[PDB]
């Protein structure tokens, strides 16, 4: 599903004394099968933006086009998978099977859940018979995170939207979660993420958009990002990737031999 944000503004509680501006005149396109990072500081409004693309928020101004068509939230919702941070903390079910199955039973009650579940559990690396009857709460932290992700791809959305999927995760969790994201991209599906951890995620993304106080201030590929975006708050290794990039090579292929201070 092609996504296009066209001149979107958002103001919470528009026309009241508690009116708060979140986004201003934001436009951008996400081609089917792109992985996009949306970044920015404190109150950039990026989370509002993801929620607007997800159809959870009707923006005060502008539109999101879906395959070149305008669409209400309720209309495209079945096509979106969205998770927030610590999604395990929203587990409702006593068996893994029901936790995974919830979205298809809710979104497509007239499709057989069993095969959609099997397939989501397998894609995420959870053996169907070995997990389907377990209590989600007593899964290991890794297994839980896999269940959470299975439960937002089970209905086969065109778009996977992850708001801070990495917060609270150790290096092993991150690697596995970002592995599942690679397989999603391999299917030709779209993924959109916010993550404070720009350094970990840039290796898995095609484009970066940066918001700043509700405004789009950068929109380009990951190459253009480290080459051109303000490097003020770049980590050590991002800054090494930058020099490298700053006319030269593609540091994203490289593996920690990366030290090309070889001048």
Binding-site residue positions: 43-48
| Options 127, 182, 230, 250; binder of a second copy; rule CB under 8 A | 127
Could you give the strand order of the β-sheet that contains 215-221, starting from the edge strand earlier in sequence?
Answer: 80-83, 159-163, 190-194, 35-39, 207-212, 215-221
- List residues forming the annotated binding site for ATP: 43-48
Smallest distance from the beta carbon of 61 to a second copy, in angstroms?
Answer: 5
| Options 68, 129, 186, 247; binder of a second copy; rule CB under 8 A | 129
Smallest distance from the beta carbon of 242 to a second copy, in angstroms?
Answer: 12
Q: Which is nearer to a second copy, 186 or 236 (CB)?
A: 236
Structural contact between residues 61 and 7, judged by C-beta atoms closer than 8 angstroms: yes
Between CA 131 and CA 92 the distance in angstroms is 16
Residue 232 makes CB contacts below 8 A (sequence gap 6+) with none
Q: Is 32 a catalytic residue?
A: no
Number of residues that bind a second copy (CB under 8 A): 78
Smallest distance from the beta carbon of 2 to a second copy, in angstroms?
Answer: 19
Query: Does 108 help bind a second copy (rule: CB under 8 A)?
Result: yes
At residue 261, what are phi and psi to the nearest 5 degrees? -80, -5
Query: Does 253 help bind a second copy (rule: CB under 8 A)?
Result: no
At what angle are helices 141-153 and 113-124 packed, to 10 degrees?
130
156-195: which residues touch a second copy (CB under 8 A)? 167-173
Between CA 111 and CA 36 the distance in angstroms is 31
Binding string, residues 49-78; x marks residues near a second copy by CB under 8 A = ------xxxx-xxx---------xxxx-xx
Binding string, residues 201-220; x marks residues near a second copy by CB under 8 A = --------------------
Query: Does 247 help bind a second copy (rule: CB under 8 A)?
Result: no
* Active-site amino acid positions: 164
């Amino acid at each position: 599903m092609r996504i296009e944000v066209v001149n979107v503004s958002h103001i919470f509680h528009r026309g009241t004394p508690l009116e708060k501006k979140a986004l201003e005149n934001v436009s951008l396109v996400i081609n089917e099968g792109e992985c996009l990072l949306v970044a920015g500081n404190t109150g950039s409004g990026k989370s509002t933006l993801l929620q607007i693309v997800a159809g959870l928020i009707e923006p005060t101004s502008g539109d999101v086009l879906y395959d070149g068509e305008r669409k209400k939230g309720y209309e495209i919702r079945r096509n979106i998978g969205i998770a927030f941070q610590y999604p395990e903390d929203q587990f409702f079910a006593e068996r893994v099977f029901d936790e995974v199955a919830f979205a298809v039973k809710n979104f497509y009650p007239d499709r057989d859940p069993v095969p959609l579940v099997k397939k989501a559990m397998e894609f995420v690396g959870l053996d169907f018979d070995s997990f389907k009857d377990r209590v989600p709460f007593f899964l290991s932290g890794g297994e839980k995170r896999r269940v959470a992700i299975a439960s937002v791809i089970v209905h086969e959305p065109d778009i996977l939207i992850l708001d801070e999927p990495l917060v609270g995760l150790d290096r092993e969790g991150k690697t596995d979660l970002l592995r599942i994201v690679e397989k999603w991209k391999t299917l030709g599906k779209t993924v959109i993420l916010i993550s404070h951890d720009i350094e970990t995620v840039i290796n898995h993304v095609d484009r970066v958009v940066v918001l700043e106080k509700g405004k789009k201030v950068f929109d380009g590929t990951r190459m253009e990002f480290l080459e051109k975006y303000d490097p003020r708050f770049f980590t050590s290794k991002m800054l090494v990737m930058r020099r490298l990039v700053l006319k030269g090579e593609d540091p994203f292929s490289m593996s920690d031999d990366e030290l090309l201070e070889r001048v």
